[PDB]
Structures are given as structure tokens and as C-alpha cells.
Design a protein around this ligand. Structure first.
Ligand SMILES: Cn1cc(-c2c[nH]c3ccc(Oc4ccc(NC(=O)CN)cc4)cc23)cn1
Ligand SMILES: Cn1cc(-c2c[nH]c3ccc(Oc4ccc(NC(=O)CN)cc4)cc23)cn1
Ligand SMILES: O=P(O)(O)OC[C@H]1O[C@](O)(CO)[C@@H](O)[C@@H]1O
Ligand SMILES: O=P(O)(O)OC[C@H]1O[C@](O)(CO)[C@@H](O)[C@@H]1O
Lengths: 439, 439
């Protein structure tokens, strides 16, 4: 009894499965409901939350009712389409919401999706009662995220940043698009019934994000994922800042083509460290937090900056287990089965007594949460760690992640803009070996 | 340039410190303010939060004004001491609060304390304005935690569970103590001014815990620690449950006196696994979550239960680095310097390319957060992992933690009661080797 086998790729101990003569094949999804008037950052919340949930391994998809509308109604003319007295467009808009819900059902019940973010105004109790009915009948959980903001400066900024550039306003100039959008918001104000956790919405699971995250009303958080979302929303901010990501300067193991270890900077690596200090100085940042791993090469690179820095064990390079300090040639010759398994499944593959890219994500989640809280940050890390962090910021899949290009002596400058990061690459003109290996 | 040395105990790379001829020695603390009427679980929140913060490595202390009062006023007679018209006792109570604040200043500014939990009613704006003045003048941050509850069943339950058993009610019977405490609560109701984040307390950093954690009002979370507290308060619950903790059944490495590795159950270990299944069955639990590490020995133990289980990489035994699969005799003979360093500083000591008990805490924090969310849970883990989890539940220090007794083939049954866990040990009558080593 208790006979187990270790799975070759992930290295997971499973019961030996001696399937009989005729082998037989043999928790609840969530609908996240966005609530609020237009230009309240609902799409911003939807997209950022989906990016985070997918990166941590929770399959998530956004269903934006406006995109179903742009598909059903070819060209957008004006706010007149959104008028409450527009009988025809009101029918079309309802059909679009129902078509999005149909796709929500298919995603969660038939495609292995775990979270569906229903991105619409959902400003009336009637619409929300209909979404609740849809969730109850399909055995889906419902979690409401309402964004409430009365600041006209914030509303005008959102229109200027991401609304005027919408495909709806292609033939319009900035002034007419802004004016049309203000009229469009006014169409929703009369029927808008905010969430009432005090009386009406007392039994609903919800978060009210008030005044661009200054205040929060949290009601009946049922589970782990809702609690995580709430914690995430409370850590993110919309303040302007820059994230600089780079690897340690070239090390002695890099020169020998050896993986892992705790080797020091080569002469070129030390030159990069000096070049990085000059680069950092030229950026003229009021305050800058510097984060390193606990491995020597990243600390030596930070030492050249003459700035305070913090060492994180979570930033340490992927653990290669038995393959640590070996070259890839020595891995292929000593462990050919292991080498081929990794090449076939680079994300899920776990090194013996070591890690996978999947393990890295789990380790890096507190790093991501702290990066969100912070402003200007410089992260000096390692190739696999950098690919993982970059996949979060650039919304790259688990399959793409182990192959992202993160060259040595190159700074990745990340600027948060619209619904994602602008990425600028800055090579600091110091030669190094190449550690990138394609599939 | 960039000359570093690796610290012998923690294995941290530090700049080589060539101190000159005359060597010279060369963030803001927080006051957590509890707010609310008596029997609102303020002391329960204070104690649990302090236990969690200390375990994660944030030095925290509770300053309970009632304990300063029991010290100043020898014997407690009745609610008459708490009367608003009691001029003398009102002076004494103020002096006690000021004496507690004096000790808060000394703890945070002179003893290396990071968080001071000011556990009092702090029901008036006047008292809170005075605490704010004290925080501003000492450069301390202020974070308010208010517990609001109108349920008379909850109030009566709190009085019966932990108030009637208070040193104040030693000479009283349950009925008179309950009656006196109800009158005592009434003394505070007239002057009680709840936190108003809408108008008056808009600029204060606060959390309102409403109806025993059913709802939360979160205002202006400034930093990392406040955000963590909020997340913790949202994950904990007061629902009745049991936590069972045990190690995997005896393994082959245990028999050889070898550390780490991924060996399977010995014949005795398999006998424990059967004994554990019978024990679990006899507990008659409606639902039970079973958690294991990703190491074979814990999975084989769970396999004997015939219950669904979840494997956590965070539950894997402490990593011994270069000392993995070695006996302690082989460690002392091959690495005598390393052996002696560990014996001297067992909590902070890091194995080369391995971990410390300090690293274990960081890894286990998500385990603790999930244990808090759950109800009936059985954790099948390893000696060092178990000591770490037990130190959290039993409020043991970093210094005590590496020496806690966690024998093989023994279940630790944890029952949450009053202000901490009741611990019952259940030996399942199966022989094994002893892996415990005293200082
Ligand atoms: C850059 N940008 C901001 C908006 C924007 C306009 N109104 C909004 C309303 C909500 C919103 O989401 C959040 C904002 C803040 C936070 N939590 C915090 O801050 C807590 N420390 C969470 C979500 C974004 C916007 C659009 N573009
Ligand atoms: C066992 N006991 C409960 C009380 C008690 C009486 N009123 C209280 C008021 C507050 C309180 O703290 C919290 C309760 C719940 C939660 N968060 C959740 O639930 C969220 N999922 C956080 C703190 C405890 C008590 C006393 N003893
Ligand atoms: O996942 P890949 O492509 O092997 O890259 C990760 C490797 O890169 C390095 O950082 C440098 O080669 C190694 O330490 C690590 O094993
Ligand atoms: O910290 P200590 O006392 O060495 O105990 C931890 C050790 O106990 C074991 O679980 C069993 O001896 C080892 O795997 C591990 O190294």
C-alpha cells in the first residue's frame, strides 16, 4: 500500500495509477461585476486585476459590453445612442450585455475559466438583479466592484487619457470627444443606483473603491480570491512612477556558461555596475528604492550605486537543484532525460530538488505586491526572476514567460500608461556573454 | 572596489568593513489605537494581531490601560468606579492612560519596538485627539482599529467567555459579574463618539470592524504594515474549529539519522499513517481539509486517510543546503564551524545554499493566512515547519521556536479558546526514533 511515483516534469508524488482494463476519465467560478458611471476606472481595474490573477495562475477574462456594442453597431456617432429615450439602442445594448453573459457562461462552465470580469456600468439594481439571477442559476459566485468618484478633475483626466483615444472617437477632435463623453455620462446619472451594503445590498459580496482608492467599503468577503482582490486593490495606486528592472552585471559563472551558484562580478560586470550608477544619476529621481537578491552579483552591482538597498531572498535566481553550477552541455550529458523534459515544458518543469518558473511566480508574488505599493524602484535581479516579473508587467502568458529576452547590461524602464506598461530598453554599452536560449 | 564578505551565521553578503583607527557606531514606529465600547473584542484583536506581527518579525507590544488600573487600584468593587460622575476614579483612569502612553514612548523610541497596540476604549474624540497629539509630537504613526457591534448575543457571549473570568470578578458569581459588566458598558455609552471617516476622522488612517468582521470601513491605509493588518483582519474569523498538526510517519532517513532528503515511510511510519486514519475517523468532523508538503513522506501519510488533500511547496522541510541527506555526526566532522555556528544561533543560522528558521517564517506566512481563513484542517508536515507553525499558534519567541518538542507519531490538536490556543497532544501508540535535539 501507499505506492507513489514522481511525475517526470513537475516532480509531484502521485499514487501509481494502474488503470483497469477499461480506463475511465471521471471550486465554484466567480463573476466579478464592475459597477459605476463611465470614466470611473472600471476598465482600468478590470484589466489590471485580470493581469494579476492570470499571472498568479487563476484563469481570468474580461467581458466588456462596449466591445460587443462596437461589434453589433459598426460606426459610433454620438451620446444620442446612450439616451434613455433611445428605444432601439436600449434593446441593442441589452442584447450586447446578454451576449456577453452567454460568453461568461461558456468561459466558466466549458473553457476552464475561473474568473469572468463583467465590465459594464451595471448602474441599476434591475441589471444587477439579472446578473445575480444568471450567477445563481449557473452556480457561479458573484463579487461586485464599484468605483465611486465625484472629483471632476479625475473624470476629465480619464476622458483625456484613455476615452478620447477610444475607437468611438476616431473621426473626432479632443474637444468634441470630451464634450460628447460628458453628455454620455449624464445619460447614466438619472437611473444610477449605487451599491447599498447598509440595506439593499447587505447580503452581496462587494468592494466600494471610493475617491480613487482613498477609502473602501468591504462587505461579506466569502473566500480566498475575493480577499486577495481586496488586498491587491488596497496596494495598487495611480501615482506617477518608474520601475527599472535589470540583471546583476556579468558574473564569473556567466563567463563559464554555468547556471546558478553565487559567483561574483567579472571585470565587465563591474564596468556595467559603474555604468548603471551613471545611468541612475542621469535619471534625476527624487527618491529611488533599490532592491537586490541575496546573491553576491546583484549586491556588488547595487554597491556601485552608493544608494541604500534592500536584499530580498525572494529575488534569488531559480534553484536548479542537482544541476546547480553546471554548464548546459554538462546537463545534457549527465541528465539527458531532464534536459529534454525542460526543453519540452520550460514553465512547469521542476529541476530535481529545485524549482520551476511556476514556483518562481509563487515566490515573487510578495515582490509584485510591494512593487505595486512603491513608486520609483530599481530591481537588480537574475534572468529567470526578471522574465517572471516582466511577464507580470507586460501581461505575458506562462508559455511565453521562460523565453522573454532579458539581456545582461540592459535596463528595462517601465512607465505605467493607459491600461498597461510602456517598456523602454537601455543598453549601458558594456560587453557581456549572451545567456539567452530560444525554444 | 565592491569588496564583500559573507556573514558566517546568516550567510548575508556585506561590504568588507575595515573600520578606521577610531571605529564609530553611527522607518517610523506605529501606535495602533483600539476604539470601541467594552466587550467588543478589542483585547481579542490586540492580542491576536500582536501574536501575528511578532511571529512575522515586527516587534509588537500591547499596552492595556485596564492592567495599569488593576496595578494602581488594588481591589475592584463595582461599575461605580466607571461612573462619569466619579471624579476621583476619572482622574485615576486618565493617569493610567498617560502612564501607558509613557511606556508606549519608551517602547517605540528606546526599546526597538516597532508597533505599540494601545488597548483601551478611546471612545471620545477628546481622548483620541490627545493620542494623536502624543503620536505627532513623538513622530509616531497612528492607525485606528474600531470594533462596532450592536448584537446583544455577541456582547453576552464575550462577557461569559472572557469577562466574568477577569481578575476584577474573582469574588463574584457569574450572574453578578455579568450584571455589573452590563452597567459598566452603560457608563461609556453616553460619551461614545464612533469614528467618522466621512467628516471628522477623514484624514485618519483607520479600519472599522463592523458586526464581528461582516463588514469593514477602511480609510487612508498609508503603508505596508497597515495594509497587512487590514488583510489579516479580513482573513481571521471567530467560527469554532480545530487545527490538527502532525509530522509525516517515520521515514527511512529518520532511521539512519539523516537530515532533509525525500525518503519514503518506514514500516513504523506506515503503521502511524493507518493509526492517523483511525484517529481522524474517530474525530467525526463534518468537513476536514488535509494539507501536506510536496515531500513523499507527508503524501504517503495523507494517502492512508482516503481523504482529498492539497500539497503545498511552502510546507516542505527546512532546506539544509550542502548538509542535505547527511547525519548530524557527518555534519560535525565535515563542517565543524557550521555545526557550532548553528548550535549558537539556531533561529538566524542559515545552512550554506540553504535556509534558516527565519526563512521558514517568511515561506509559511501564506500557510498561516490560509489556516486563519479555514475551519477544520489537518497539516501533515516536518519537524522545523511544525515548530514554526506551533510558535505562531502558541505565541513562542524566535529564540524558543527551534527547540519546540514536535515528536513523531503524535498529533497536536489546537482548539481556539479565550485569547489563545488550547493544545492537546495525542500519541498514536506507534514506536519511532527521536529526532529532538536540545540546546
Ligand atoms: C491612471 N488612471 C487612473 C484612473 C482612474 C480614474 N478614476 C479611477 C477610480 C479607480 C481606479 O482604480 C483604483 C485606484 C486606486 C486604488 N487603490 C489605491 O490607490 C489604494 N492605495 C485601486 C483602484 C482608477 C481610476 C484612470 N487612469
Ligand atoms: C471568540 N470571540 C469572539 C469575540 C468577539 C466579540 N465581538 C468581536 C468583535 C470583533 C472581533 O474580532 C474580529 C472578528 C472578525 C474578524 N474578521 C472576520 O470575521 C472576516 N472574515 C476580525 C476581527 C471579535 C469579537 C470574542 N471572543
Ligand atoms: O531558464 P533558463 O533559460 O535556463 O535561464 C535561467 C538561468 O539563467 C541564469 O541566470 C544565467 O545563465 C542561471 O543562473 C539560470 O539557471
Ligand atoms: O532544526 P533541527 O533541530 O535540526 O530539525 C530540523 C530537521 O529535522 C528533520 O525534519 C528530521 O531530522 C530534518 O529533515 C531537518 O533538517
Amino acid at each position: 500500500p501507499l505506492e507513489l511515483t514522481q511525475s517526470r516534469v513537475q516532480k509531484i508524488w502521485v499514487p501509481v495509477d494502474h488503470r483497469p482494463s477499461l480506463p475511465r476519465s471521471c471550486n465554484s467560478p466567480t463573476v466579478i461585476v464592475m459597477v459605476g458611471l463611465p470614466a470611473r476606472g472600471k476598465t482600468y481595474i478590470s484589466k489590471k486585476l485580470t493581469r494579476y490573477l492570470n499571472w498568479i495562475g487563476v484563469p481570468t477574462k474580461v467581458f466588456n459590453v462596449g466591445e460587443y456594442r462596437r461589434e453589433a453597431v459598426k460606426q459610433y456617432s454620438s451620446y444620442n445612442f446612450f439616451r434613455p429615450d433611445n428605444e432601439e439602442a436600449m434593446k441593442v445594448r441589452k442584447q450586447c450585455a446578454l451576449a456577453a453573459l452567454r460568453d461568461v457562461k461558456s468561459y466558466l462552465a466549458k473553457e476552464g475559466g475561473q474568473i469572468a470580469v463583467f465590465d459594464a456600468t451595471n448602474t441599476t439594481r434591475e441589471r444587477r438583479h439579472m446578473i445575480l439571477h444568471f450567477a445563481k442559476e449557473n452556480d457561479f459566485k458573484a463579487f461586485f466592484i464599484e468605483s465611486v468618484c465625484d472629483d471632476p478633475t479625475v473624470v476629465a483626466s480619464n476622458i483625456m487619457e484613455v476615452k478620447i483615444s477610444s475607437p468611438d472617437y476616431k473621426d473626432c477632435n479632443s474637444a468634441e470627444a470630451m464634450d460628447d463623453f460628458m453628455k454620455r455620462i449624464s445619460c447614466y446619472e438619472a437611473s444610477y443606483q449605487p451599491l447599498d451594503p447598509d440595506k439593499c445590498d447587505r447580503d452581496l459580496s462587494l468592494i466600494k473603491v471610493i475617491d480613487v482608492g482613498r477609502r473602501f467599503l468591504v462587505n461579506r468577503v466569502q473566500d480566498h480570491i475575493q480577499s486577495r482582490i481586496v488586498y491587491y486593490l488596497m496596494n495598487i495606486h495611480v501615482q506617477p512612477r518608474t520601475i527599472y528592472l535589470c540583471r546583476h552585471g556579468e558574473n564569473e559563472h556567466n563567463l563559464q556558461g554555468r547556471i546558478g551558484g553565487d559567483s561574483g562580478l567579472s571585470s565587465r560586470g563591474k564596468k556595467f555596475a559603474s555604468a548603471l550608477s551613471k545611468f541612475v544619476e542621469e535619471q534625476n529621481l527624487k527618491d529611488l528604492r533599490v532592491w537586490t537578491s541575496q546573491l553576491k552579483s546583484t549586491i556588488q552591482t547595487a554597491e556601485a550605486l552608493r544608494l541604500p538597498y534592500e536584499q530580498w531572498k525572494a529575488l534569488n535566481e531559480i534553484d536548479a537543484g542537482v544541476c546547480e553550477e553546471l554548464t548546459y552541455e554538462e546537463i545534457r550529458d549527465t541528465y539527458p532525460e531532464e534536459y529534454a523534459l525542460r526543453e519540452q515544458d520550460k514553465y512547469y518543469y521542476r529541476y530535481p530538488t529545485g524549482e520551476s518558473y511556476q514556483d518562481l511566480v509563487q515566490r515573487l508574488e510578495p515582490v509584485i505586491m510591494e512593487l505595486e505599493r512603491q513608486e520609483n524602484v530599481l530591481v537588480i535581479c537574475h534572468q529567470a526572476v526578471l522574465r517572471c516579473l516582466l511577464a507580470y508587467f507586460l501581461d505575458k502568458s506562462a508559455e511565453e514567460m521562460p523565453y522573454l529576452k532579458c539581456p545582461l547590461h540592459t535596463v528595462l524602464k517601465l512607465t505605467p500608461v493607459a491600461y498597461g506598461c510602456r517598456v523602454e530598453s537601455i543598453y549601458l554599452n558594456v560587453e557581456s556573454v549572451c545567456t539567452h536560449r530560444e525554444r
